[PDB]
Design a protein around this ligand. Structure first.
Ligand SMILES: CCCCCCCCCCCCCCCCCC(=O)OC[C@H](COP(=O)([O-])OCC(O)COP(=O)([O-])OC[C@@H](COC(=O)CCCCCCCCCCCCCCCCC)OC(=O)CCCCCCCCCCCCCCCCC)OC(=O)CCCCCCCCCCCCCCCCC
Ligand SMILES: CCCCCCCCCCCCCCCCCC(=O)OC[C@H](COP(=O)([O-])OCC(O)COP(=O)([O-])OC[C@@H](COC(=O)CCCCCCCCCCCCCCCCC)OC(=O)CCCCCCCCCCCCCCCCC)OC(=O)CCCCCCCCCCCCCCCCC
Ligand SMILES: CCCCCCCCCCCCCCCCCC(=O)OC[C@H](COP(=O)([O-])OCC(O)COP(=O)([O-])OC[C@@H](COC(=O)CCCCCCCCCCCCCCCCC)OC(=O)CCCCCCCCCCCCCCCCC)OC(=O)CCCCCCCCCCCCCCCCC
Ligand SMILES: CCCCCCCCCCCCCCCCCC(=O)OC[C@H](COP(=O)(O)OCCN)OC(=O)CCCCCCCCCCCCCCCCC
Ligand SMILES: CCCCCCCCCCCCCCCCCC(=O)OC[C@H](COP(=O)(O)OCCN)OC(=O)CCCCCCCCCCCCCCCCC
Ligand SMILES: CCCCCCCCCCCCCCCCCC(=O)OC[C@H](COP(=O)(O)OCCN)OC(=O)CCCCCCCCCCCCCCCCC
Ligand SMILES: CCCCCCCCCCCCO[C@@H]1O[C@H](CO)[C@@H](O[C@H]2O[C@H](CO)[C@@H](O)[C@H](O)[C@H]2O)[C@H](O)[C@H]1O
Ligand SMILES: CCCCCCCCCCCCO[C@@H]1O[C@H](CO)[C@@H](O[C@H]2O[C@H](CO)[C@@H](O)[C@H](O)[C@H]2O)[C@H](O)[C@H]1O
Ligand SMILES: CCCCCCCCCCCCO[C@@H]1O[C@H](CO)[C@@H](O[C@H]2O[C@H](CO)[C@@H](O)[C@H](O)[C@H]2O)[C@H](O)[C@H]1O
Ligand SMILES: CCCCCCCCCCCCO[C@@H]1O[C@H](CO)[C@@H](O[C@H]2O[C@H](CO)[C@@H](O)[C@H](O)[C@H]2O)[C@H](O)[C@H]1O
Ligand SMILES: N=C(N)NC(=N)NCCc1ccc(I)c(Cl)c1
Lengths: 104, 112, 171, 347, 48, 83, 95, 140, 174, 98
């Protein structure tokens, strides 16, 4: 219940500050004074997609602090290094294929 | 067994003869493949690359022999299973009482 | 289906050990050593029977031993123990390692006044053996009789009679 | 595509299929399909043109939808049996969902619309994979879950596929669309017999793959993708025209050729089960396939269509395409009927 | 509660087996004040 | 030996960040197999008792099973106290 | 599996996670462990055609543990009766 | 489709004509609705009303055939006093063919439909009499 | 009551789905999915799945949905169309909410409902487990077992992710 | 079944109908595909957590990881479609009509 209250307070206050920031006295009485390819490089797509794939790999590494408590440490250490090495191979592939370049 | 091409129990069966007519046909198919290989590449059909034609026959025969071994084993297993089941359930496979045609009545249908 | 058989409310009555979790934590190590025998008998019963209704009497003896154990502490070492579990209770995680001075006083009191020796690291996690008069359950799962296995094909493998017998093929 | 990358991508298409075939866990089956779909897309896209991009997108949408439905079937099965083992499902709604998902993956009617379009939009070598190797994994799951499939559903899919495949092929001049509708028709025979004898499903699948690979390989050999382009073969490689004729007649189920064997065996199994109307209806409807196979033989082998003058320049050069295994496959595609009893190895 | 409900055996198991079965929350706290049910069901999950 | 030494000096001068990465990754793969302490990580993980140690019914022929936790039979954590 | 490579090589690729009564970390049991164990042992080796009939009792109990449909229905019955009596004043719950 | 087919095949032939005609009209109408659904889905109508018109034209046409087959086949069996006769169904099937020759207005289609729907209807009656299985249950 | 928190969250879950499934502007459709994701995490949280709940936030919302919004801004919609401005979207949106409200109202009035299949309406708490006193998270034990038990899963998962990198570089090179 | 399952299955059905009923944007259809994944993740997680199937606790993660990789492939196809035609409208993908 506490976490819900904290979240509700944080965003309710944020909402109140935003609305009052928009509606304050102004003291004036007169009249006040689409879905296409945005010209944006394919390189920026590849960054976001590259981030996603690395983020999915990170999801698999997150259990590592708990996995190190296993008695099957031989298997666990081999699989941890395998996953990270494969992540490094992914980076090496993008790097050597000019996927990390910003020219052209 | 389990994921076994020829289980150990297949070794109790007589192997296919090396002069099996089905194995001769398999060798003949390999020979035909050798000739078609020459034809599609516009070589002299009968004479070109006898070394290649020899391996076509040998490869077909070699694989055909093991396929024929597995084929005969599977049919031996089908018969083994069938007879053992007939024994296990004698109530479902009784010996029919046989009557001679002197006793059996058959209607006669003249052709006139 | 049948009626779920339950014991009577009076069949479940027993003196309860109404002390807080920090009190139990402070006494846990000596309690494990002192009341091991009735405790292990009860836990053997629970794992063998897989039924809480079948080990109620063993559970009453667990309570009795715990009460007598805490009556001995109260008689002899009430003051060092009170200082010790009160130190445990302050911690939000009830950490042993923040109360070693008070633990030493309590430990030194039970050793002199009762001969209680605190078990060593690793001892209370040992698997021990229990001598019980209770019969060993025979069908604790209440399993029905298993279906008979399929009749087992056996004999000598012979060539198929007349071959594949597929339509006109003679082999 | 870098040749080493091409090899690794091809090996991953195969690995995804193999994972499906060796898995005993529904999650690993689902992974195999996902891995397989990931690796197939690049080979559909490899010639970089709007038609290839449209084909890959239509393929992605169909296969991803089917894989979500498969996952839903797996999860319903988990709730109603508490286990993941690949076998009969323990809920009729799960069985329907998995059957529909596998039908979409196979391109069976009425989920067939993607097959002619995707096959048309990708290169011949990619179409060969799509219509042969890609049928292995979904068929290998049907092989295992069939004890729980709804009989009326599976036979309705089979009948619709044979009808749609036969009718759809009558109106085609593009070779890739002909093979696509032919594939839809042949999937119908494979699944029609599945409830009765899955071994005949495997036999029809294997013979289908051999014959389909032979046709695609002969089309690749001459770089032909249309009926008229194929009609020039007689003036360049006469031997090829004869091999196409034999393979097409075999694909038409004519005895004494190989392609008669699956229809023969499937009719036998169905009649043993007192299914008489369905096999007869199936066999007559398959004459539609024979018709548009025969049309191709007419324009390829049995008559000589007009040529062009530049064709003479082609006379001075030899065929350089690999045509891997073509001599072996064409012999199997046509001359296997005398070895029909060999099907028992598939038991 | 079920004294005058026809064909209702009181305390009848829903399982064929006579083995002891651990009850679920609804069986234990089926007829108790919501304050205790909420604490039993979501107290641990919600504790800070 | 020398051509490799001339290779390392070049990457050390040009790509010290990558040389350090590969060096650390190699040590992460190799050192566990060489370390004499690696065997203790297995033992400590197994010595942590997460669930109750269910006692065994005594059939009269288990002389290696302690009757009491403070008896001298069964695994000892003396090795761990020193470590 | 279509090709039972796992059993041929004696290697466990995914069998470990197929059922909830298999070995679990730290011997944590599933809620329906005993019911799944009983059903699996009843149906073992006799084939699914036979098991669908001969092990219906174990499977029905296992399904009841899985989804608790019969238990919830019974609880719904007792609660509904209690509301009526509260709505008619013939029942006052104890403390 | 199961229950509707169960009502129809429960009524004895040559009797309860109004119930037989209702069962076939519902069967025919449902087939018309299915055809309309696919037709509208795959060949998009130029407007909302064209699509509704197409649904009515197809559904009414299919219900018209279903009604005429049921009535004519039940009237024939009743009048001739032959319940278990495939000829009655052959008569009703051709009547349906004529209707399909009228809704599409094509003497050729009507003649072809009557022969083929007439033959198909007779085979259905024979199958019911003799236990022919279309989707046969696996047995061996 | 807070005894129906899981049910209430699942009601919002469905409303978010009817939101983007009616397919408004992909910008607003993305918002509906983000709200559904957060509500879906709360549902998983209340069943004792803390890690699984936070993975939805970390990976599904902070990962995949960010890339969806990023891609939408680039190659789809740069400025949203007014929400519910199209009649088809409004009809679909209203229809799903009307169906949902009826399910909720009927299951709450009778404490059970038969929408195709029959469901119980007593509250989800009734099926919860009644005996937990272990010194660890069981969900954490299971996920940590990926590295001891799931060697095969790690291999095929890691391989697919690497191939995903190679594949997407092939697709996009054009 | 439990009350929560009513709405989770409803969410999957709603997203499936959304997926099968296209409008114009391909991205809108890709969002429905992710919606089905999210409902599958919740339904699987609830079933696994409630039943205390301990080793199955990793399965929803594997589902999430693989389906996100699928979505990345789907997005890459969308941008290639958008590069060709300037929009992600499905009506432009009708060349293979003939
Ligand atoms: C080296 C020789 C090795 C050797 O010494 O032994 C072989 C054999 C002698 O061994 P054997 O054990 O003493 O058996 C001789 C008995 O008389 C025969 O032994 P059998 O009594 O056991 O009978 C042979 C048996 C053995 O099992 C076989 O099935 C063998 C299949 C023979 C293939 C023949 C294909 C040509 C069919 C006619 C065309 O055949 C059958 O089981 C059933 C009959 C199969 C008939 C095949 C035709 C029906 C198939 C449908 C498609 C084709 C329709 C016709 C077109 O000598 C041969 O006759 C050769 C065998 C035939 C095949 C190999 C030759 C290829 C011929 C190509 C034909 C070209 C067609 C042109 C058009
Ligand atoms: C019983 C049911 C019915 C009968 C069942 C029949 C089943 C098929 C049987 C196997 C058929 C394999 C093809 C026959 C071999 C003939 C090809 C040949 O002579 O290549 C000689 C080959 C190269 O000759 P080539 O000048 O390139 O032209 C041959 C064909 O055009 C090469 O053109 P290709 O593109 O067709 O090459 C295919 C072959 C690659 O070509 C080969 O190297 C033939 C390898 C055949 C292996 C033998 C299989 C039997 C042993 C089972 C284990 O692919 C493979 O890797 C083998 C699969 O020389 C070798 O290196 C011998 C293999 C060394 C090991
Ligand atoms: C639980 C189950 C699931 C619960 C779902 C509850 C609702 C929650 C939302 C679910 C997502 C719904 C997605 C709706 C959508 O996006 O469709 C866009 C879809 C096409 O999007 P559009 O590009 O903007 O064009 C709009 C029109 O099609 C106008 O453009 P047009 O060029 O097509 O104009 C010609 C018009 C011609 O319309 C006609 O001719 C129809 C005549 C039929 C008479 C009967 O064609 C159409 O309207 C297409 C449909 C044709 C009818 C198909 C056969 C029915 O618009 C619609 O078709 C509106 C239908 C909305 C009703 C949703 C009801 C869902 C109920 C599912 C069945 C559950 C029962 C169990
Ligand atoms: C035991 C004896 C068995 C006798 C029966 C055999 C017939 C049954 C097996 C037939 C199966 C097909 C056999 C493989 C075909 C090989 C023939 C071929 O493809 O080449 C034709 C060739 C043309 O002559 P050529 O000047 O060499 O020009 C080569 C063009 N690339 O022709 C030649 O000039 C090469 C000389 C041999 C030609 C053999 C032609 C056989 C035609 C069979 C037609 C199909 C059966 C009907
Ligand atoms: C039994 C049937 C055996 C089938 C063998 C078929 C081998 C392929 C036919 C030879 C054609 C020449 C060739 O090399 O294959 C073409 C294709 C590569 O494509 P290509 O454009 O030629 O060059 C690649 C550069 N990107 O290479 C390929 O991608 C091979 C495609 C065929 C793989 C699927 C074969 C069917 C499944 C067989 C499994 C049976 C179970
Ligand atoms: C699984 C269980 C599903 C059972 C239903 C199976 C039916 C699936 C039909 C799939 C094929 C649909 C394509 C087709 O048949 O053609 C579409 C056709 C359009 O043409 P139409 O408007 O009917 O007539 C005008 C002609 N000048 O319109 C149609 O013919 C649609 C009606 C086809 C169904 C009969
Ligand atoms: C000690 C083992 C520790 C485990 C390490 C974990 C796995 C990491 C795998 C990374 C593999 C990268 O492999 C890398 O490939 C490219 C090939 O173009 C090589 O780099 C090469 O291409 C670049 C251009 O990009 C040239 O400028 C350079 O002269 C050349 O060396 C790198 O020298 C090599 O390091
Ligand atoms: C691209 C593929 C990348 C794959 C990378 C795989 C790299 C694996 C490197 C480490 C593998 C071995 O790592 C370590 O080796 C020693 C061997 O001395 C093992 O053995 C050590 O621990 C075990 C405990 O199980 C003790 O019983 C043993 O006495 C001790 O020697 C360790 O259990 C293991 O943790
Ligand atoms: C395209 C790439 C293809 C690469 C193919 C590589 C295949 C790798 C197979 C890995 C599985 C090997 O075989 C399997 O491994 C694990 C760990 O070693 C073992 O599992 C071990 O760890 C956990 C601990 O509880 C349990 O699974 C089990 O108690 C224990 O035996 C299995 O008992 C063994 O059957
Ligand atoms: C150009 C020709 C095109 C192909 C034509 C194919 C015709 C195939 C024949 C139709 C199939 C047989 O039709 C089906 O037979 C079975 C017989 O068990 C009937 O079985 C019926 O028997 C009993 C009493 O008789 C009924 O109460 C019950 O409703 C139903 O089970 C079905 O009501 C009928 O629908
Ligand atoms: N499922 C079916 N209907 N058919 C089937 N496989 N029947 C099993 C009978 C059989 C037949 C041939 C062989 I060789 C073997 Cl060993 C066994």
């Amino acid at each position: 219940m506490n976490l819900m209250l904290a979240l509700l307070t944080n965003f309710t206050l944020a909402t109140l500050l935003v609305i009052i920031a928009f509606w304050l006295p102004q003291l004036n009485v007169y009249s006040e004074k689409g879905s296409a390819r945005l010209p944006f490089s394919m390189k920026f797509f590849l960054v976001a997609i590259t981030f996603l794939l690395f983020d999915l790999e990170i999801a698999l590494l997150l259990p590592l602090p708990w996995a190190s408590q296993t008695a099957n440490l031989n298997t666990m250490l081999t699989m941890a290094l395998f996953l990270i090495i494969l992540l490094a191979v992914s980076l090496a592939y993008e790097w050597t294929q000019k996927g990390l370049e910003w020219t052209e | 067994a389990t994921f076994q091409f020829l289980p150990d129990e297949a070794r109790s069966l007589p192997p296919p003869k090396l002069t099996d007519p089905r194995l001769a046909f398999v060798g003949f198919l390999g020979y035909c493949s050798g000739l078609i290989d020459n034809a599609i590449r516009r070589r002299p059909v009968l004479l070109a690359g006898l070394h290649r034609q020899l391996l076509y026959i040998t490869s077909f025969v070699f694989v055909g022999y093991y396929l024929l071994k597995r084929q005969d084993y599977m049919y031996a297993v089908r018969d083994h299973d069938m007879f053992s089941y007939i024994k296990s359930h004698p109530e479902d496979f009784p010996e029919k009482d046989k009557k001679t045609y002197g006793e059996v009545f058959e209607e006669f249908h003249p052709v006139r | 289906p049948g009626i779920v058989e339950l014991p009577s409310l009076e069949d479940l009555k027993v003196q309860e050990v109404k002390v807080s979790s920090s009190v139990l934590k402070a006494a846990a190590h000596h309690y494990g050593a002192q009341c091991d025998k009735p405790n292990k008998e009860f836990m053997l019963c629970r794992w063998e029977e897989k039924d809480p209704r079948r080990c109620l009497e063993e559970g009453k003896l667990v309570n009795q031993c715990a009460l007598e154990f805490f009556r001995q502490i109260k008689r002899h070492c009430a003051e060092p123990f009170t200082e010790y579990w009160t130190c445990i209770d302050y911690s939000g995680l009830q950490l042993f390692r923040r109360c070693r001075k008070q633990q030493a006083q309590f430990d030194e009191c039970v050793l002199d006044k009762l001969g209680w020796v605190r078990p060593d690291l690793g001892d209370l996690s040992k698997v021990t053996k229990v001598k019980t008069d209770r019969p060993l359950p025979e069908n604790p799962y209440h399993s029905r009789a298993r279906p008979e296995p399929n009749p087992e094909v056996e004999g000598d493998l012979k060539p198929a009679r007349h071959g594949s017998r597929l339509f006109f093929w003679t082999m | 595509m870098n040749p080493i990358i091409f090899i690794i991508i091809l090996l991953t298409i195969m690995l995804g299929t193999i994972i499906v075939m060796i898995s005993s866990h529904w999650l690993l089956v689902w992974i195999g399909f996902e891995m397989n779909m990931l690796a197939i897309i690049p080979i559909m896209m490899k010639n970089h043109n709007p038609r290839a991009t449209e084909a890959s997108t239509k393929y992605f949408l169909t296969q991803s939808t089917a894989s979500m439905l498969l996952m839903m079937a797996v999860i319903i099965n988990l709730m109603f049996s508490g286990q993941w083992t690949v076998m009969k499902l323990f809920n009729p709604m799960a069985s329907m969902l998995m059957t529909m998902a596998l039908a979409m993956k196979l391109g069976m009617a009425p989920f067939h619309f993607w097959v002619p379009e995707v096959t048309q939009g990708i290169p011949l070598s990619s179409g060969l994979i799509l219509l042969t190797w890609q049928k292995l994994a979904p068929m290998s799951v049907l092989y295992q879950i069939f004890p729980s499939i709804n009989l009326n559903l599976i036979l309705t899919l089979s009948v619709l596929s044979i009808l749609i495949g036969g009718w759809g092929g009558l109106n085609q001049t593009q070779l890739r669309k002909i093979m696509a509708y032919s594939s839809i028709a042949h999937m119908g025979w494979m699944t029609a017999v599945l409830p009765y004898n899955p071994t005949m499903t495997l036999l029809n699948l294997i013979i289908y793959i051999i014959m389909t690979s032979t046709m695609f390989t002969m089309f690749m050999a001459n770089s032909t993708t249309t009926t008229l382009s194929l009609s020039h073969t007689w003036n360049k490689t006469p031997i090829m025209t004869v091999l196409i004729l034999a393979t097409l007649l075999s694909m038409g189920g004519l005895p004494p050729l190989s392609g008669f064997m699956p229809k023969w065996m499937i009719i036998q199994e169905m009649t043993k089960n007192n299914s008489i109307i369905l096999p007869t209806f199936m066999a007559i409807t398959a004459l539609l396939n024979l018709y548009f196979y025969m049309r191709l033989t007419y324009s390829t082998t049995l008559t000589m269509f007009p040529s062009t003058n530049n064709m003479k320049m082609k006379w001075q050069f030899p065929l350089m395409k690999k045509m891997t295994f073509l001599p072996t496959m064409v012999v199997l595609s046509t001359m296997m009927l005398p070895l029909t009893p060999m099907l028992s190895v598939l038991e | 509660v079920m004294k005058d409900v026809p064909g209702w055996k009181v305390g009848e198991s829903v399982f064929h087996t006579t083995r002891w079965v651990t009850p679920m929350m609804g069986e234990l706290y089926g007829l108790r004040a919501s304050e205790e049910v909420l604490s039993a069901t979501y107290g641990f999950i919600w504790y800070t | 030996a020398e051509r490799v030494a001339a290779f390392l000096k070049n990457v050390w001068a040009k790509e010290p960040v990558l040389v350090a990465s590969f060096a650390i990754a190699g040590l992460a793969v190799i050192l566990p197999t060489l370390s004499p302490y690696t065997k203790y990580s297995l033992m400590i993980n197994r010595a942590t008792p997460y669930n109750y140690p269910v006692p065994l019914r005594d059939d009269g022929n288990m002389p290696d099973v302690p009757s009491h936790p403070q008896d001298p039979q069964g695994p000892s954590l003396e090795w761990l106290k020193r470590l | 599996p279509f090709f039972d490579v796992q059993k041929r090589l004696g290697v466990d690729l995914d069998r470990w996670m197929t059922i909830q009564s298999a070995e679990q970390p730290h011997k944590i049991p599933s809620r329906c462990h005993a019911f799944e164990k009983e059903w699996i042992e009843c149906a073992h080796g006799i084939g699914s055609i036979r098991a669908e009939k001969e092990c219906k009792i174990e499977f029905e109990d296992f399904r009841e543990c899985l989804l608790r449909q019969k238990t919830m229905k019974r609880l719904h019955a007792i609660r509904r009766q209690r509301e009526k009596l509260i709505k008619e004043g013939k029942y006052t719950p104890p403390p | 489709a199961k229950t509707v087919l169960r009502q129809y095949w429960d009524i004895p032939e040559g009797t309860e004509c109004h119930r037989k005609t209702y069962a076939t009209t519902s069967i025919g109408g449902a087939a018309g609705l299915v055809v309309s659904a696919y037709s509208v889905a795959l060949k998009t109508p130029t407007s909302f009303l064209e699509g509704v018109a197409r649904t009515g034209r197809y559904t009414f046409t299919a219900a018209a055939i279903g009604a005429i087959f049921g009535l004519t086949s039940c009237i024939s069996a009743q009048v001739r006093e032959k319940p278990d006769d495939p000829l009655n169904y052959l008569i009703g099937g051709c009547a349906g063919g004529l209707i399909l020759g009228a809704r599409t207005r094509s003497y050729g289609i009507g003649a072809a439909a009557c022969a083929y729907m007439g033959l198909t209807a007779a085979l259905v009656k024979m199958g019911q009499l003799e236990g022919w299985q279309v989707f046969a249950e696996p047995k061996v | 009551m807070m005894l129906y928190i899981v049910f209430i969250l699942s009601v919002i879950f469905v409303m978010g789905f009817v939101g983007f499934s009616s397919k408004p502007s992909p910008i607003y459709g993305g918002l509906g999915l983000i709200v559904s994701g957060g509500v879906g995490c709360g549902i998983v949280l209340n069943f004792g799945g803390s890690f699984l709940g936070l993975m939805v936030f970390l990976i599904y919302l902070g990962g995949m949905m960010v890339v969806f919004g990023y891609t939408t801004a680039m190659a789809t919609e740069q400025y949203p169309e007014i929400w519910l401005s199209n009649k088809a979207v409004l009809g679909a949106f209203v229809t799903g909410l009307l169906m949902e409200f009826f399910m909720v109202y009927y299951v709450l009035k009778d404490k059970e409902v038969e929408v195709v299949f029959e469901f119980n309406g007593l509250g989800d708490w009734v099926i919860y487990d009644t005996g937990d006193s272990g010194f660890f998270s069981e969900e954490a034990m299971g996920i940590a077992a990926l590295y001891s038990y799931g060697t095969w899963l790690v291999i095929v998962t890691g391989w697919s992710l690497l191939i995903g990198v190679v594949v997407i570089m092939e697709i996009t090179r054009g | 079944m439990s009350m929560v399952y009513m709405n989770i299955m409803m969410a999957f059905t709603v997203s499936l109908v959304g997926l099968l009923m296209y409008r114009s944007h391909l991205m809108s259809s890709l969002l429905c595909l992710e919606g089905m994944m999210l409902s599958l993740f919740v339904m699987a997680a609830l079933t696994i957590l409630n039943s205390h199937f301990t080793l199955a606790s990793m399965m929803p993660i594997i589902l999430l990881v693989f389906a996100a990789c699928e979505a990345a492939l789907g997005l890459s196809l969308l941008v290639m479609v958008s590069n060709t035609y300037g929009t992600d409208y499905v009506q432009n993908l009708n060349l293979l009509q003939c």
